[PDB]
Amino acid sequence: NREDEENNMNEVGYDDIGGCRKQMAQIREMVELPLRHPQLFKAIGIKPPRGVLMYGPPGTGKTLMARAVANETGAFFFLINGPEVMSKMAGESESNLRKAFEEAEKNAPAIIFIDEIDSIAPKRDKTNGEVERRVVSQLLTLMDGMKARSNVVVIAATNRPNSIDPALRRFGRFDREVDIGIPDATGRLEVLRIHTKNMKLADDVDLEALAAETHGYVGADIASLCSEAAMQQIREKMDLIDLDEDEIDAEVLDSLGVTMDNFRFALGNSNPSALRETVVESVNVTWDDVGGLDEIKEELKETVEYPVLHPDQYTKFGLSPSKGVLFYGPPGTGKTLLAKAVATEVSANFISVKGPELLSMWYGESESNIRDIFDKARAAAPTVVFLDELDSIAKARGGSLGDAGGASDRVVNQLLTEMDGMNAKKNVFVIGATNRPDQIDPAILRPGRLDQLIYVPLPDENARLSILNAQLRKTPLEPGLELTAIAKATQGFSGADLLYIVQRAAKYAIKDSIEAHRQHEAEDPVPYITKEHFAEAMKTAKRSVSDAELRRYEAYSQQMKASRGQF
Amino acid sequence: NREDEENNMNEVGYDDIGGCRKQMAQIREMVELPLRHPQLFKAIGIKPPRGVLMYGPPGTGKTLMARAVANETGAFFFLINGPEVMSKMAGESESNLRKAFEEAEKNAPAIIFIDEIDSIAPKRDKTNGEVERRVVSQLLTLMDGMKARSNVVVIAATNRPNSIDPALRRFGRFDREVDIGIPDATGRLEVLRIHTKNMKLADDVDLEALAAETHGYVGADIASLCSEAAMQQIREKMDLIDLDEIDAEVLDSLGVTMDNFRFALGNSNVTWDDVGGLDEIKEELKETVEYPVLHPDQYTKFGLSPSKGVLFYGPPGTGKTLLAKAVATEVSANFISVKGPELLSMWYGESESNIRDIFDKARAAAPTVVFLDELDSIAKARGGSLGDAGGASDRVVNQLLTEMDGMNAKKNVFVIGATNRPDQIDPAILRPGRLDQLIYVPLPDENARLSILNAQLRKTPLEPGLELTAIAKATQGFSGADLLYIVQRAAKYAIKDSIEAHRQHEPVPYITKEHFAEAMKTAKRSVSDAELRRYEAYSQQM
Amino acid sequence: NGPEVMSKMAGESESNLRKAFEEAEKNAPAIIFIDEIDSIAPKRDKTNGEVERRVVSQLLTLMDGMKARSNVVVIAATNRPNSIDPALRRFGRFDREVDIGDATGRLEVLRIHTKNEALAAET
Amino acid sequence: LLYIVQRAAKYAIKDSIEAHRQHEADPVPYITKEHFAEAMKTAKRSVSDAELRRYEAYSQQMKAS
Amino acid sequence: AAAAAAAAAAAAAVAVAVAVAAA
């Protein structure tokens, strides 16, 4: 049939499974090479491996590679789904396995693909039931016993190889474990090229930029990105085209394409599947929103982007990048705002954490959560981890009286060994924010964990002008007013307090607008906030931070600065 | 057939779901368009998404929407529930899943709805059972595999998506996670109209006010409310007539008054006049509260989100909770009253979970006003604690800070604080953006307390004249709570006098002036002068 | 009956309930009296069995759904009404709860049972 | 010391990328003295005197034991 | 006229531990 002709040509292959060549090379070796040239193996006098375990995070290409091998190799293929074999009748799962292996051996020199063995082969010492123990023992004796495996090779796929019987992880049963892992930039580019081979893309789309901007996508998310971009484009073109009660007009199908805007929208919308648990609600901030603190903004941009944008120079200079920063100062100065701006206008992934957000009452579960979040961050690198209000989760362990249950000390030790310990040195930048540095563990503020401690001060005159202009960028204003007097009058306020003044100006303008609007309906009077509203909104203006906390923050600042002396 | 005609009419479909147009748009885009015009998809060269995970609170209309789209489309519908498919023996739950998918793919192009999926996918890590792991693996293999499925769509329903195996929320299994949230005022109006398409109303019936006063009732709640109100009407207008073993001309006069719906909302799951004095505080709070909600268009035009927090501090029994309740009644926003020491816990890391839960509920049920009563108990001075309880207090105050002002979407949530000792609070909550306004509630003057007495006597049977000015001027040191106690004592004295007078007979319908005098003869003062001096000093230093 | 319907044998319990309901809906508009419903209402949340939760879902399907009931009313009976499902106690399935909890009624029962004051006050 | 080295490398990277952008509008094959001079202005000693005294007191107690 | 058998699993309770804060 016509559908069969295209479907037959639609069979996957080696060209379709691009993104990881080394693992592909190993699988190709084992599956084909002893079948193409057995004479060289008998010449060298050894038999090849005949067992594989493909493992990795979900959606990387394991089942796809198995399908590709099935389509390419001319040998007989036998697929076994995981929970397909066992039934209620005692002694039937083993009968099914025996029948499967018997068919494979009797038919031809074949391949057996067993999908999701983590369910069929758990650790015997841990399981309490009996049928699973019997079936795993059956699989062991069937795969490696006496007079077994006459030219048969087994392939396995799993998302969690650790939960496998150790007796299965040895030579003869599963010879070597192929790691089908997260692709790199070139791998993502290759995946994009593969998925955009049959699509009618526009002439203005380049895939290099997309591959560069997408970071932690596992390759199953690239298909999602392509599908979502196609969906946006078709939605846009259908809002124009008629309801199309009949068959779609031939005039629109001849002119179809997907522009860079669709892909960009999908990229801004999509998120890697691994981090879908830790997604952050869409909050919009931009660098133009953060007034003042220009040096800090520039330095943060550099320290977050240079390891990402320019890794070639780093590797040519032969040194690592810096992966830490701490913000400390009076409250409301803009630390959280800087974090939001980073999360919005930085390409690397973002992980947001509240203060106690990961603390549980169970034993060791807080440390389990810490390990989980850092493992996610390391897997989906480059990544930015924001630890808001650090002093809640990381205090001076053992100082004064420790935790009664001794849990704070354990969690801070786990945090220590996750930020600096035996690891693979991935791109994970830790952003810290606190307003009480004296209660922080000295072992966290060391270089290599939190390198540079940036102090955000109260805004000066120019910073006040900058923040006022940033806050009033989108409001409608008359040309008459000038904010320099507003900035000068304060002399001690913070960005939060200036926001409060602007808010009261807005409320007074709102009151006047409603008061002037009601008479129009009873029987656009103030399209902008006038100088009177600002003049009258400061009547209830009071300083936010007192004179006792400010002196403490400053004194800590000079205490830190003094140790830098003698230079 | 008589029932056959109702079968077609009762067939759920479009216009039955109200308040989820965007989500309905996405779902119908996924379900109908590829089945309506597949030639364009074959031309563009990309398979459609074929998996959805609808989530949200229970009883919102997830099953309704799935059934509606399925019945509208020509696809076969098969429903699978959580507990029904899982068993105790070994090796049949996966068989059930396999048979379901097999017959669905064998019969016709079908739409499958797995209701309550969170009971089948426990994440394979926080779970010890073996059958659950095996069924999760079977579900994964059925959804994706060597020629797994074709021309079939799957939808799931859950309340806690986080408690699902991440391998299920991958492209090809669950493509787009649609949020079926609580509906707004417009959604509530349209669902009321939808549910009232067949019932007969009265002339003086409006649904906008009903949508206004109803806050958290969603979907099935609305259906149950309407059904039981109609049933009560039917039962009420059947006993007052003779129980005939009946003329349609008299039966077709049923209607539905408003009082029926009033008590319907009163039994199913104060006012501005009740507060005396505090006029400037009342009007300031009123503007700050209902200006965002009554005029959102102009705020969008100006581009500035409003302030949220307020803090009252002063003597107890003054009416902070009274103002909070008045707000809860005077705006449709939900009210969440939480006491100070209520959130604490001897366990480790549980007060934090409590705070996360209450704030998540407040943000989910927006607009909302959250009343933190006795905030001094939680938000202790973060520095001078020096103890393990001090560490716990530091933890909880940090959680409060990061929750009320943190990486959030800025939903409409208003935090109201109330304390009688404002100088034991960390000055991080008091910064603008968390709790900007510092309102001081003083002891009421003579006119204020007279108005308080008048408001308290709003519905109390009273003589034509009581001369409240004397009692008002003779209680210079009292508070609103104390005045309420005096009024209650007078009422109980009148009640017992009437009971004693009528006992001999078996007398005054209104509280007499003599009764009021002998009730005022006993009184107590709950506030000293030192507390007033402390509050005055705090206000002066502020 | 509650414990009678029990048919562990290849989960025939749901078949028994279906046959019962079909028989009540087949002949005439009738009245179904399911006795001792607390034994077959495992709240589907504290129970760990299989048939219980399966027969709870069968009852919730037979009581509400597409063409669920056509002019037929069901009656239940229990001792502790708190061990029932919140989905079973909903409107449309079990929308009315009647409290059948005196001395004059006990004396009337004593008079009508002995037809063919201390006895009403002591018992 | 690693922090000093990292900061010097960062300034070198900055100068290199700035020079490249100028070129469009190997300039720095190696790290210069000025890079260290500018990067050493924010050098901090992580270990404090209190912790140093605690550690040496523990060591002397171990010796005396 | 032929018999048969069947093996089925059973649930088992599991203990736990929990840290506790204190004053």
Ligand SMILES: Nc1ncnc2c1ncn2[C@@H]1O[C@H](COP(=O)(O)OP(=O)(O)O)[C@@H](O)[C@H]1O
């Ligand atoms: N948004 C809604 N609009 C109209 N009716 C609704 C809505 N949500 C629920 N209902 C009503 O509630 C009843 C049960 O809803 P259900 O489908 O069980 O909801 P959910 O899937 O959210 O649990 C239905 O009969 C339906 O008429």
Ligand SMILES: Nc1ncnc2c1ncn2[C@@H]1O[C@H](COP(=O)(O)OP(=O)(O)O)[C@@H](O)[C@H]1O
């Ligand atoms: N201004 C007032 N007008 C009327 N009743 C008042 C007033 N102030 C206090 N009350 C009465 O006092 C009682 C308790 O007041 P409440 O709001 O709990 O006080 P607090 O502000 O100390 O928390 C209420 O039942 C209320 O009727």
Ligand SMILES: [Mg+2]
């Ligand atoms: Mg796979």
Ligand SMILES: [Mg+2]
């Ligand atoms: Mg902050």
